[PDB]
């Protein structure tokens, strides 16, 4: 165990349309991945 996510800006977007800063925050939110990059 350490920190749980990085502070890396690597935007991704979940199947629920939400933009997550890195892939870790997407995984912690439990949403499946859909897009790479930001959503709108």
PDB file of C-alpha atoms in Angstrom:
ATOM      1  CA  UNK A   1       0.000   0.000   0.000  1.00  0.00           C
ATOM      2  CA  UNK A   2       1.110   3.570  -0.730  1.00  0.00           C
ATOM      3  CA  UNK A   3      -0.981   6.339  -2.289  1.00  0.00           C
ATOM      4  CA  UNK A   4      -3.874   4.749  -4.224  1.00  0.00           C
ATOM      5  CA  UNK A   5      -3.897   6.854  -7.370  1.00  0.00           C
ATOM      6  CA  UNK A   6      -1.110   8.753  -9.087  1.00  0.00           C
ATOM      7  CA  UNK A   7      -1.257  12.513  -9.776  1.00  0.00           C
ATOM      8  CA  UNK A   8      -0.764  11.787 -13.464  1.00  0.00           C
ATOM      9  CA  UNK A   9      -2.904  13.700 -15.968  1.00  0.00           C
ATOM     10  CA  UNK A  10      -3.941  10.844 -18.272  1.00  0.00           C
ATOM     11  CA  UNK A  11      -7.602  11.581 -19.003  1.00  0.00           C
ATOM     12  CA  UNK A  12     -10.036   8.793 -19.692  1.00  0.00           C
ATOM     13  CA  UNK A  13     -13.826   8.623 -19.817  1.00  0.00           C
ATOM     14  CA  UNK A  14     -16.127   6.036 -18.277  1.00  0.00           C
ATOM     15  CA  UNK A  15     -19.212   4.316 -19.699  1.00  0.00           C
ATOM     16  CA  UNK A  16     -21.251   6.791 -17.651  1.00  0.00           C
ATOM     17  CA  UNK A  17     -19.729   9.685 -19.601  1.00  0.00           C
ATOM     18  CA  UNK A  18     -17.656  11.049 -16.709  1.00  0.00           C
ATOM     19  CA  UNK A  19     -14.112  12.239 -17.323  1.00  0.00           C
ATOM     20  CA  UNK A  20     -11.553  10.876 -14.860  1.00  0.00           C
ATOM     21  CA  UNK A  21      -8.138  12.497 -14.497  1.00  0.00           C
ATOM     22  CA  UNK A  22      -6.181   9.235 -14.640  1.00  0.00           C
ATOM     23  CA  UNK A  23      -7.290   5.643 -15.266  1.00  0.00           C
ATOM     24  CA  UNK A  24      -6.890   4.981 -11.523  1.00  0.00           C
ATOM     25  CA  UNK A  25      -9.700   7.368 -10.563  1.00  0.00           C
ATOM     26  CA  UNK A  26     -11.871   5.672 -13.213  1.00  0.00           C
ATOM     27  CA  UNK A  27     -11.120   2.277 -11.636  1.00  0.00           C
ATOM     28  CA  UNK A  28     -11.726   3.533  -8.075  1.00  0.00           C
ATOM     29  CA  UNK A  29     -15.120   4.868  -9.193  1.00  0.00           C
ATOM     30  CA  UNK A  30     -15.931   1.368 -10.470  1.00  0.00           C
ATOM     31  CA  UNK A  31     -17.078   2.507 -13.897  1.00  0.00           C
ATOM     32  CA  UNK A  32     -16.050   0.542 -16.928  1.00  0.00           C
ATOM     33  CA  UNK A  33     -13.752   2.374 -19.344  1.00  0.00           C
ATOM     34  CA  UNK A  34     -15.277   3.656 -22.591  1.00  0.00           C
ATOM     35  CA  UNK A  35     -13.176   6.420 -24.172  1.00  0.00           C
ATOM     36  CA  UNK A  36      -9.593   7.582 -23.863  1.00  0.00           C
ATOM     37  CA  UNK A  37      -9.354  11.342 -23.408  1.00  0.00           C
ATOM     38  CA  UNK A  38     -11.930  13.691 -21.917  1.00  0.00           C
ATOM     39  CA  UNK A  39     -15.701  13.570 -22.478  1.00  0.00           C
ATOM     40  CA  UNK A  40     -18.291  16.335 -22.806  1.00  0.00           C
TER      41      UNK A  40
END
